Amino acid sequence: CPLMVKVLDAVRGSPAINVAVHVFRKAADDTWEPFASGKTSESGELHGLTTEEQFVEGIYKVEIDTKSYWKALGISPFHEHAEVVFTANDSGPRRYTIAALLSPYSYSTTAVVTN
Amino acid sequence: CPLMVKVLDAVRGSPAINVAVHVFRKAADDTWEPFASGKTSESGELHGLTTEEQFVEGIYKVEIDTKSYWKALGISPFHEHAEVVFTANDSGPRRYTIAALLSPYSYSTTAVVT
Amino acid sequence: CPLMVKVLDAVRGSPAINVAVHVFRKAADDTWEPFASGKTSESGELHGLTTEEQFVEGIYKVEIDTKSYWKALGISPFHEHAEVVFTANDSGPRRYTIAALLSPYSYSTTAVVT
Amino acid sequence: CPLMVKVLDAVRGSPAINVAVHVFRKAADDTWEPFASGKTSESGELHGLTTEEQFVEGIYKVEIDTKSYWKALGISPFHEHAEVVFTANDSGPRRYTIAALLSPYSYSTTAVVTN
Numbered sequence: 001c002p003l004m005v006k007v008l009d010a011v012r013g014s015p016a017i018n019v020a021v022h023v024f025r026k027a028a029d030d031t032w033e034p035f036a037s038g039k040t041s042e043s044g045e046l047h048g049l050t051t052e053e054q055f056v057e058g059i060y061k062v063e064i065d066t067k068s069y070w071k072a073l074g075i076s077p078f079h080e081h082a083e084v085v086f087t088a089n090d091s092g093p094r095r096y097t098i099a100a101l102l103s104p105y106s107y108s109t110t111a112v113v114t115n
Numbered sequence: 116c117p118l119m120v121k122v123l124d125a126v127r128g129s130p131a132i133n134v135a136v137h138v139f140r141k142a143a144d145d146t147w148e149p150f151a152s153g154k155t156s157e158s159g160e161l162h163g164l165t166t167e168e169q170f171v172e173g174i175y176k177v178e179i180d181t182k183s184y185w186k187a188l189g190i191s192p193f194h195e196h197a198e199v200v201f202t203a204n205d206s207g208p209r210r211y212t213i214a215a216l217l218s219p220y221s222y223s224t225t226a227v228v229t
Numbered sequence: 230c231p232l233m234v235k236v237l238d239a240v241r242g243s244p245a246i247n248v249a250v251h252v253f254r255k256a257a258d259d260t261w262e263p264f265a266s267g268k269t270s271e272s273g274e275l276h277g278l279t280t281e282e283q284f285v286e287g288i289y290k291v292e293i294d295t296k297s298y299w300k301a302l303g304i305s306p307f308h309e310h311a312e313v314v315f316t317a318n319d320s321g322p323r324r325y326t327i328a329a330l331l332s333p334y335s336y337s338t339t340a341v342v343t
Numbered sequence: 344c345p346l347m348v349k350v351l352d353a354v355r356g357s358p359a360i361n362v363a364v365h366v367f368r369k370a371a372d373d374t375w376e377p378f379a380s381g382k383t384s385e386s387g388e389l390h391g392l393t394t395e396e397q398f399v400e401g402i403y404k405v406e407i408d409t410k411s412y413w414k415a416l417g418i419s420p421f422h423e424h425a426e427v428v429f430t431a432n433d434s435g436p437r438r439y440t441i442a443a444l445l446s447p448y449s450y451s452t453t454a455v456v457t458n
């Protein structure tokens with residue numbers, strides 16, 4: 001699993017379940033083309049987004065639909081979504097874990113990169 | 116000052132100075148059109164981006180060029196930049212403060228609306 | 230104003246008002262002796278805790294009563310309080326700003342030293 | 344595993360390895376008595392701190408020796424350590440995951456509580 005996304009809820013102290021995640025790859029014409037998508041599981045994790053063969057070097061954007069998540073909980077969020085943009089595999093294949101901690105008016109995101 | 120941006124450095128424990136910030140407004144055709152831009156001051160703050168008259172309801176994107184900031188410090192950052200996308204509600208007198216705490220592989224952002 | 234505290238609310242997107250803050254200094258016998266205290270203002274800030282003369286080198290602990298803050302809002306918090314323990318170096322002119330972003334089950338704290 | 348601690352490094356984008364962790368329980372005399380201790384593994388995690396039987400209701404303090412961690416990396420940290428104080432099991436046994444994201448002058452901590 002070269003790309004994994006984990007989302008936590010800072011208000012309820014639990015994984016953020018059923019959060020929609022869309023991944024895009026910057027195309028040759030500087031356009032964002034759909035790469036993969038899914039929803040976080042009961043553990044707040046999303047696996048199987050891509051394969052080592054498909055996950056080539058490039059600039060990727062991980063969009064986390066935080067707005068819909070908070071709306072479903074009856075909380076008016078500030079952000080439309082949380083975006084994480086990064087260059088991947090520019091120096092060989094790596095394993096990426098993109099994590100996000102969500103709050104209605106704030107979010108923190110970090111990345112753990114492994115060989 | 117309807118919109119203000121503040122950036123901090125979590126590695127050095129100081130304001131993030133000279134950080135480029137670009138603000139965009141979503142156009143009728145779902146395109147991001149330039150709205151305002153500038154660089155954070157010595158206090159890591161950026162004021163005077165817009166006026167109450169110009170800052171109408173809509174979806175705005177604040178792009179913080181974090182990559183260039185870390186590069187200038189000799190640190191390889193993870194993110195290309197930090198983006199904050201939000202809807203300006205306008206309902207009632209409101210000042211928006213977008214703050215971001217930067218680390219090489221992480222960043223936290225919060226909004227203070229008063 | 231050598232030491233300043235700022236607290237924000239990540240749930241409501243506003244300053245954390247009326248938050249009790251207690252500052253302690255580690256005594257010669259490794260005990261925490263009261264140093265200063267107060268409550269955050271409408272801007273979520275707390276100034277005038279000490280003076281340059283009184284704020285000598287040493288280990289300080291800033292305790293933020295986060296529990297009471299969330300209780301007053303009807304939210305069951307996880308932490309008893311938020312503690313920030315640091316050493317005041319003094320080496321060179323320095324102002325310390327301790328900031329904390331609060332959520333019911335999480336909090337982030339950073340220090341800005343200028 | 345009723346109590347687990349996970350520590351990440353926001354500067355290197357990796358788990359924080361070999362971080363000393365001390366857990367204390369507030370005694371009847373308002374004193375902090377040693378409860379358990381250990382060091383994070385290669386995954387930045389610390390398991391086996393206690394058992395369901397030993398982890399009774401009470402106020403616990405998880406002290407993460409962040410200072411030593413940054414010192415070993417040649418970085419002058421701001422905090423002496425990171426402390427997480429919370430009441431546990433006050434309404435029945437729960438599983439607690441205490442996570443911390445570390446930076447030289449900042450740290451974020453969150454808790455994930457499960458049944």
Ligand SMILES: O=C(O)c1ccccc1Nc1ccccc1C(F)(F)F
Nearest residue numbers: 214215216223328329330337338339
């Ligand atoms: O640090 C400050 O002085 C500050 C002042 C105004 C607004 C935000 C600020 N800091 C900040 C910014 C983003 C995420 C967390 C914090 C924290 F944790 F610091 F609150």
